[PDB]
Design a binder for this molecule. Sequence first.
Ligand SMILES: CCCCCCCCCCCCCCCCCC(=O)OC[C@H](COP(=O)(O)OCCN)OC(=O)CCCCCCCCCCCCCCCCC
Ligand code: HEM
Ligand code: HEM
Ligand code: HEM
Ligand code: HEM
Lengths: 77, 388, 388, 52, 70, 51, 31, 116, 60
Amino acid sequence: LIPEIPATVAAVKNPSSKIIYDEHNHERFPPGDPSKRAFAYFVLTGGRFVYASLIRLLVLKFVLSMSASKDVLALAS
Amino acid sequence: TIRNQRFSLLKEPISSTLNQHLIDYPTPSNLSYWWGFGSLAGICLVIQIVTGVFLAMHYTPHVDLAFNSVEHVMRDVEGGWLLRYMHANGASMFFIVVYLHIFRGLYYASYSSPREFVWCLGVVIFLLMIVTAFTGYVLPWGQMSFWGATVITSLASAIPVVGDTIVTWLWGGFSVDNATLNRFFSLHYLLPFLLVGASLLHLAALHQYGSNNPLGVHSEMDQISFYPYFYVKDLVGWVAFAIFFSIWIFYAPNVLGHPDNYIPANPMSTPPHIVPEWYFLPIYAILRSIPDKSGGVAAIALVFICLLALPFFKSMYVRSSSFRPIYQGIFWLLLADCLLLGWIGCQPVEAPFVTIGQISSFVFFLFFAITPILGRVGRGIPNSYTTD
Amino acid sequence: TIRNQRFSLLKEPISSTLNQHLIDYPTPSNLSYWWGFGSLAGICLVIQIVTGVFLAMHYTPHVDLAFNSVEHVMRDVEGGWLLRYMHANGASMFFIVVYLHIFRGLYYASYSSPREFVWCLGVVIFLLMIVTAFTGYVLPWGQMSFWGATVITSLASAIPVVGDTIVTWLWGGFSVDNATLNRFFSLHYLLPFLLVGASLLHLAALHQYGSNNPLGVHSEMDQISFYPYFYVKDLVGWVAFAIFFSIWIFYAPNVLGHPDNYIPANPMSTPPHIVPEWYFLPIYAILRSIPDKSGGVAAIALVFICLLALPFFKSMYVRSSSFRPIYQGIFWLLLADCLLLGWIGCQPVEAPFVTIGQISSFVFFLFFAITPILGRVGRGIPNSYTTD
Amino acid sequence: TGSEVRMLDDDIPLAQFAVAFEGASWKDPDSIALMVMQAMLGSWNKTAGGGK
Amino acid sequence: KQIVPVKSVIYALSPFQQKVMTGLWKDLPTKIHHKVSENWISATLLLGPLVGTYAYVQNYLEKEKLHHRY
Amino acid sequence: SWAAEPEMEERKLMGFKWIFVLSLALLQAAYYRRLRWSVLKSRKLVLDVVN
Amino acid sequence: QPADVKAAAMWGVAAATGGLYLVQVSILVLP
Amino acid sequence: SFLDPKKNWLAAQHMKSLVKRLSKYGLRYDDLYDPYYDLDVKEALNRLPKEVVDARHARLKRAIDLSMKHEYLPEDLQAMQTPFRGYLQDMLALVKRERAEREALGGLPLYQRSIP
Amino acid sequence: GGIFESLYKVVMRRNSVYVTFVIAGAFLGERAVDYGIHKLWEANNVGKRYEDIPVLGQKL
Ligand SMILES: CCCCCCCCCCCCCCCCCC(=O)OC[C@H](COP(=O)(O)OCCN)OC(=O)CCCCCCCCCCCCCCCCC
Ligand code: HEM
Ligand code: HEM
Ligand code: HEM
Ligand code: HEM
């Protein structure tokens, strides 16, 4: 009647199992469903493949740039 | 919480400063992809430094060997073409992402209080970047490098009292010659480390007051740590930048360049079109547009005066331009004018380009001369639109 | 205290970190002048950086032009002999000051807890100084320069499986030619900035754990601010160092060097006496003394392992040498051994110098192997000498 | 499911939270092991005599 | 640099209990509608001066070319 | 044109390979970011305020 | 301790594989 | 001059656009005043009642959350929004007037901005 | 789902095994991409390579 209890107070004092999320740019899975935990890990694994390959490329490029050159290789007879 | 025994190696003194200022520094949870450019200019600087060191292991600063040494890196050194194209197109990328950094700051009014020191250190960083890129571009000793150096350093004799004395001291002689090449090489090697120091001071000031946000409002209510929430965002930014940079290295390695630089410098012949790199073009355009070359140098100084004077304007309590329609339109007009002015720089100094550049410079300075008026007038908005 | 209105500029955020760490840092009240030696080493590093930049404005890293370019600096450049003598003799004084720094640390056992990180960062700094000075000495391209580069780089072949590959890769082309000259110039220019970073980390760790004192005791009872009390002491040290360094520059500038570096490099003939600079002589003497060059390289690695292993000793309760007569004598014997070892390195391999060096290096490692024993016995002392 | 709820008040002296995994059924043979695991993660109190 | 508590109540969900990449192309036409409707003024201000100046320059260049071409 | 750019073939091969591979990396990085931020971008907060 | 030994051995295997992938000494490996 | 939306069509359009934007993000015009900006807004917020300041913080948090999620307020609350219903301008004017008086006759600043 | 969970329980229980898998996958993917791009190159520009000119060995 008189109180008009606040929204946060009413939420705290009345826990409910019908929890509602935003679901604007991230749609929920139906409540009973296994979590696709492995699929994300394999996606990240492919990305890590790429990152390791790029790091290897860069290190080798710099180090072998510091290496000998075709000029001295051809000069040595 | 008495630290009697160790909990987390992140909180130990060896990793505590890094912990705080990188992993645990709170940032607003609504930052867009426009802050990744600040995160990405540092990566560009690191790329430039590493490629430059590995290039300097092969470059000879003499006047009879610089061009042939650069071609030696091109041809004989294994992977040398990758190093040189990385260095050149990486200077270009550095300037691109720094321009995006600056223009996001302008759009969201990040220069406003309390980040005046952040903006001013950014302006000093911009000076350092410009000088480094120029003195580095003189290094390959091509026609464009030699004659751009001649023109720009000779246009330092506009100072009334000293002039010729400073020019002679800077040249190490009477013309751009071997002494100037060696001097420019040493300075080009040194300056990037001062640039790293300036970047660190830039970041220290920003971390003192915290980053802005698209709304421009106080944002200490909803904040999250930097890692991992913004680490992955910056990772997406870095990979997109890597794709862009790889396109610009492996398929169009000379499009951003100027073909006349592949001619060995010849002081007895002048190329028909002496112009700087594309990222000095707006400054060059303002300088040429203002006649009476002393006036041009004065205008170039005035540009930096305006940039440094931006953060010290009037009230203008609302800062983000998402809630400022007039300032939003003004910003878009400024960006269009800067792009047009950059286009003008590459054009000859004939008509109508003279008039187009004279109007463009006036608009560019009018932007700075109009914003305090916008703030003063908008200071009294709530009293007029109130619904009482 | 609520900082409503600002009192002092030093406590403002722009100068707050500098205030703390430079003006207000509490320091033990009884420090002698060797802490001044640490500050003096910092100043020597700055002097080296500045003179090196201005020298690199005139040095050509080509094999056909390096020597004549240095003679250019000496004869033609306005006040260039001053720059070159300052750089060379400043390298020498840098090493003198760092040696006095290290030996004060050894005498007062400053490596003990909790300054293990300070000592380890110091060891890393010493490695960086060694590398920088070596690659710099290669730059003038004389007989001693070329042949010392040859020998010290070719002793890297002692690695078991990848020695030859590393030697060839570092040489860049089967010899120590132009490629090695450019490589060494770039590295010599780069390394001092890493050295500055290492010095800053060194100072940060020390500032974390305070500072030792001639007594080795806890010293948080009587502590005074760094400024002005230790700034003036450091100033006295700096002026005395300036007089010493001016004696070296102007009157005896070539005493600390060898006359073979004034002959242009000729890879055909070999000078009869190949020795490094005087400050590498102890290490050279150890390496030469232990035969079977693989054993020599292993012995140098062992020297640095011992230096890194000093801080992590077991009991070592009493710190200063003022209350450790046995350790005081051991330290003085070690210093005499180090001086003798340095003198041996300049002598030929003919007898008896082989025996003397093989004894001196053994005594060096003996010092490094008998400090824990003294620590354990000293830990045993208090329950024996009780007077009751 | 696996989710969280956070009731920030800041007018309360002490913060209280519970973090939980999914346990076992009554008839699961691993419930005894879960009981043992709970035993070796035992409770601690500010007034407990065990102390440290 | 302090935190300002707000007295909220926040329900969050595990990142493994909700689909990830579908929201990119979910409700695409309305997204494009927003992007075009709330920004056409800005695009007009950014591009209009550029295309207008280009048209003016080409007109002037061609007119001078014809006039001077004898 | 060969004498002025003897590295064209190797340069183009490297470019094609790395553009493709980095595009795959970009896709993975986008997935990683959307997965990390999925907790925040789908929360429901009750604030006790209306206007 | 046995679990620590197994973990250390596996980490050594991983590091050796990484070094081998970085250096690519397939030509060198005769035995 | 003083141009209000009643006597200016351009001012009417400007006010309409500002109302639309603020209603989209559901925060009053006074909420845009940064306490770190002026330090007079900081004092004015220090003098306001706790209910008002807490409402301001809640509205700002809601706006920031909507900004992160890349969405706007639902049309119901958007029609329930009341921008330009000020709560701070009078107090800010009082604070600035007091500061002006204190500066005008003798006086030291009651608060100052750090450097920087 | 089942396949992903199975490979997960195979190769994602110890981080050392995961790092070995990442490195091996990077190597194999690099070599496979090399081979594919080379085949595309051969298919695209046929009749231009060095060992294709009709008179490669007749300048003597
Ligand atoms: C030929 C092959 C073999 C070669 C070696 C053979 C000899 C080994 C050593 C024999 C002598 C050992 C002496 C040890 C007992 C010292 C007693 C002592 O501490 O006496 C007190 C005295 C205090 O001095 P002070 O205060 O001036 O006295 C006034 C008193 N009111 O204290 C002193 O005077 C301090 C004396 C310090 C002496 C330190 C060095 C000798 C002892 C250790 C030897 C280690 C040798 C190997 C390592 C050498 C260094 C690298
Ligand atoms: C310490 C770090 C750096 C070193 C050692 C270095 C060294 C060099 C060297 C040796 C060259 C000549 C080789 C060549 O022309 O390709 C060069 C060129 C150049 N550098 Fe740097 N550089 C460094 C940092 C930078 C930075 C930070 C920038 C950008 C701001 C930059 C911009 C350039 C440009 C534009 C050229 C001309 C490239 C060309 O046209 O060929 N450099 N640099
Ligand atoms: C070397 C080039 C530069 C680097 C590495 C750099 C680095 C950074 C970094 C890391 C940040 C924090 C992350 C971010 O907010 O995006 C930042 C923010 C900022 N920078 Fe820079 N910056 C550079 C150049 C500039 C320049 C030239 C300016 C302007 C003159 C500038 C002005 C700013 C501003 C205003 C911010 C605050 C962003 C905000 O609103 O939160 N920066 N910069
Ligand atoms: C670039 C050369 C070096 C510089 C600039 C440097 C600088 C400093 C500075 C400024 C201090 C603090 C002031 C002082 O106590 O003297 C210090 C202390 C110290 N340094 Fe260094 N240092 C250098 C090399 C070394 C080396 C090579 C070591 C030994 C490996 C070392 C070990 C120490 C120790 C143990 C302290 C502690 C001082 C004490 O206990 O009172 N330093 N250094
Ligand atoms: C970034 C700063 C530095 C630069 C740019 C630099 C540059 C140079 C150059 C160009 C030379 C050859 C000029 C000559 O022959 O006199 C040189 C020589 C030398 N430098 Fe440096 N240097 C620097 C710092 C240092 C440091 C920190 C040391 C260590 C003490 C050092 C040790 C030497 C030595 C021993 C020589 C040979 C002296 C001689 O000419 O006989 N340099 N340096």
